[PDB]
């Protein structure tokens, strides 16, 4: 329950160092940017997610 917390809460930075504060709606935008999806898809379709 600590690791299920900080994946949603602290992002990916809890195991790589000190835990940052990233809100959750901005976390899925950066995880789309690694696979080649720009932020147009997440913010428009957010009610359908």
């Amino acid at each position: 329950s600590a690791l299920l917390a900080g994946t949603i809460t602290s992002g990916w930075t809890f195991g790589a160092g000190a835990a940052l504060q990233i809100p959750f709606a901005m976390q899925m935008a950066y995880r789309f940017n690694g696979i080649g999806v720009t932020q147009n898809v997440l913010y428009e379709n957010q009610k359908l997610i």
Binding site: T7, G15, A16, R31
Partner: protein, 48 residues
């Protein structure tokens, strides 16, 4: 199997992984571990 189970925590859970059919089928977002007797249950969130 536990060395592969420690690999999925270091890749699929604690970070973003670009791998194909490692963290599950499709493009990978994040993974949710669950407590299990004599093991661990992974819940993968995939982009299809």
């Amino acid at each position: 199997s536990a060395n592969l189970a420690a690999t999925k925590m270091s890749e699929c859970v604690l970070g973003q992984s670009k791998r194909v059919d490692f963290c599950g089928k499709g493009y990978h977002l994040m993974s949710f571990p669950q407590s299990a007797p004599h093991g661990v249950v992974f819940l993968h969130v995939t982009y299809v």
